[PDB]
Amino acid sequence: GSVIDPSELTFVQEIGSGGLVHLGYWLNKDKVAIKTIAMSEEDFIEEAEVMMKLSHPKLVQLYGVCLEQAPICLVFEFMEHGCLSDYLRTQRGLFAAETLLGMCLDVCEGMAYLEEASVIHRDLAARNCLVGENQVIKVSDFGMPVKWASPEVFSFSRYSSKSDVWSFGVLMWEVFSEGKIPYENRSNSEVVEDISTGFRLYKPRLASTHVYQIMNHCWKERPEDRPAFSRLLRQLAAIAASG
Amino acid sequence: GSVIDPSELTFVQEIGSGGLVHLGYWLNKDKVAIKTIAMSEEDFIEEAEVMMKLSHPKLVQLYGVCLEQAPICLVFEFMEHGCLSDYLRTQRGLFAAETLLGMCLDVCEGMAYLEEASVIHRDLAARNCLVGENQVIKVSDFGMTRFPVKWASPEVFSFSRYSSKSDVWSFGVLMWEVFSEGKIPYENRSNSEVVEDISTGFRLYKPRLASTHVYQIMNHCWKERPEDRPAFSRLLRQLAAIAASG
Numbered sequence: 001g002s003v004i005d006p007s008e009l010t011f012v013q014e015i016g017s018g019g020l021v022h023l024g025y026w027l028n029k030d031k032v033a034i035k036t037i038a039m040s041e042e043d044f045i046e047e048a049e050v051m052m053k054l055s056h057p058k059l060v061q062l063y064g065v066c067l068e069q070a071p072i073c074l075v076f077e078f079m080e081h082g083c084l085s086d087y088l089r090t091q092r093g094l095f096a097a098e099t100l101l102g103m104c105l106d107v108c109e110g111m112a113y114l115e116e117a118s119v120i121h122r123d124l125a126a127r128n129c130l131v132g133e134n135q136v137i138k139v140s141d142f143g144m145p146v147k148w149a150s151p152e153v154f155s156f157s158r159y160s161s162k163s164d165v166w167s168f169g170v171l172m173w174e175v176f177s178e179g180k181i182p183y184e185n186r187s188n189s190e191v192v193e194d195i196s197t198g199f200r201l202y203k204p205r206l207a208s209t210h211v212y213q214i215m216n217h218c219w220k221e222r223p224e225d226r227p228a229f230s231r232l233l234r235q236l237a238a239i240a241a242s243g
Numbered sequence: 244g245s246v247i248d249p250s251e252l253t254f255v256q257e258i259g260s261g262g263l264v265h266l267g268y269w270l271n272k273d274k275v276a277i278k279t280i281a282m283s284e285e286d287f288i289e290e291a292e293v294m295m296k297l298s299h300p301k302l303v304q305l306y307g308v309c310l311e312q313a314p315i316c317l318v319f320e321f322m323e324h325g326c327l328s329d330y331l332r333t334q335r336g337l338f339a340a341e342t343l344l345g346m347c348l349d350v351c352e353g354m355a356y357l358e359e360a361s362v363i364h365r366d367l368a369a370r371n372c373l374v375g376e377n378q379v380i381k382v383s384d385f386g387m388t389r390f391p392v393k394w395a396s397p398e399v400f401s402f403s404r405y406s407s408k409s410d411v412w413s414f415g416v417l418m419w420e421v422f423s424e425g426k427i428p429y430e431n432r433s434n435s436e437v438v439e440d441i442s443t444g445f446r447l448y449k450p451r452l453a454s455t456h457v458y459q460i461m462n463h464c465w466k467e468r469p470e471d472r473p474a475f476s477r478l479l480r481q482l483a484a485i486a487a488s489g
């Protein structure tokens with residue numbers, strides 16, 4: 001991908017904590033979000049290298065990397081509405097169910113591509129999705145939190161695209177609940193035992209029974225019983241089409 | 244990339260021919276341009292494969308490939324204003340100079356990325372760029388790693404020698420198209436006339452809407468020797484400075 005010179009970046013305002021994130025411009029033209037880098041530089045950079053070779057409409061894009069001056073940073077396209085979790089909260093009460101479903105559809109399209117690419121996200125959550133023009137949703141940080149973790153993950157550290165699917169289920173809950181916090185006020189140990197016991201998140205009122213069904217498919221205890229993103233995509237679309 | 248089942252595509256209206264292109268939807272949801280494939284299927288597909296691993300905000304994207312039934316098709320994101328050449332022609336008279344310069348920047352950003360990846364476009368012209376929301380421009384048809392003299396550098400029309408530097412020559416002509424609002428380059432001229440004019444150092448006149456600064460950059464792109472043309476990476480900074488300076 002393209003190397004970007006420090007001189008070409010305008011840092012207009014912070015909007016992120018972690019490294020940090022700024023709203024800015026590149027070449028005084030393109031609106032961008034700039035991510036400044038503990039964690040090795042080479043890993044931070046390789047993460048960008050991975051994402052710059054994964055092109056999908058529902059996956060965020062970089063303009064490039066700025067390695068000249070410390071701290072180094074990555075330059076992403078600016079997303080007009082920012083993080084999905086925030087957007088859900090601020091726009092709470094304005095969402096039709098069809099729209100919320102559309103959002104899950106976007107993410108699932110992104111993830112089905114990643115799945116195909118043999119890429120495991122490991123941290124899929126609304127906070128790791130972005131909201132752009134016309135409320136299109138993109139997945140972010142896909143080139144590398146018990147509440148989004150599958151049972152085999154928090155128990156055996158066994159990641160797969162199937163563990164990502166679990167996380168996607170929780171993302172769906174976040175979306176349909178208009179940005180509520182999952183297992184709020186529950187400790188990590190409580191989440192683990194509760195889920196191992198069979199507990200699942202409740203159906204948010206804007207989620208039809210059809211939507212909740214799919215959520216529960218994502219939350220199947222055995223990875224092999226969860227649908228791959230590619231099949232999950234068609235399940236979600238079917239719900240939309242049936243009205 | 245993702246495989247797309249034929250059942251998932253709705254074909255609304257034909258928007259282009261050349262395979263055919265249709266406005267459509269995938270999953271009754273995402274607005275898409277579907278490109279239906281004589282030419283090799285394996286090449287048609289590899290083209291998509293190349294494009295799916297090149298992610299840049301100024302390069303067009305695919306939702307996936309639909310292989311299951313012939314004629315097979317590629318499924319691109321829909322670009323609301325379509326082909327840049329067409330858009331320029333239909334909206335001729337309405338563009339501000341700043342808008343036209345912004346369009347060249349968009350393309351140059353995409354090309355710098357391809358350049359860095361050692362991807363040689365070979366057919367960089369307005370008709371091979373697309374205009375999306377907010378009039379962003381994306382480069383298209385950059386996946387073919389394996390006629391049109393009007394976009395051809397001398398080393399191309401003489402020796403069929405392609406490189407990022409011949410792409411840059413082509414880009415210069417693209418700039419001309421943009422600032423001329425979709426006019427035909429070398430309109431009254433035969434191929435041999437073009438070869439002669441270029442070979443003797445002559446270049447496309449400066450369009451009314453191009454400033455002298457814009458025209459300077461066109462001319463850098465039209466250096467006789469490829470080694471004298473700036474890389475897309477450097478061209479970018481030249482273009483940005485002109486927007487800045489006003």
Ligand SMILES: CN(C)Cc1ccc([C@H]2C[C@@H]2C(=O)Nc2nc3ccc(-c4cn[nH]c4)cc3s2)cc1
Binds near residue numbers: 076130141
């Ligand atoms: C009021 N309007 C017109 C101006 C305005 C100002 C600020 C914002 C911020 C919510 C917008 C935002 O946060 N955009 C972002 N885009 C990205 C893109 C990528 C990344 C990113 C990718 N990996 N790491 C970070 C973060 C952001 S935040 C929106 C609108």
Ligand SMILES: CN(C)Cc1ccc([C@H]2C[C@@H]2C(=O)Nc2nc3ccc(-c4cn[nH]c4)cc3s2)cc1
Binds near residue numbers: 303
């Ligand atoms: C007016 N509205 C309601 C209908 C309508 C009809 C036609 C158009 C055409 C300008 C639109 C257009 O042609 N869009 C296109 N998008 C793409 C995207 C990718 C590709 C492509 C990439 N490789 N090969 C083809 C071609 C097109 S044409 C817009 C709106």
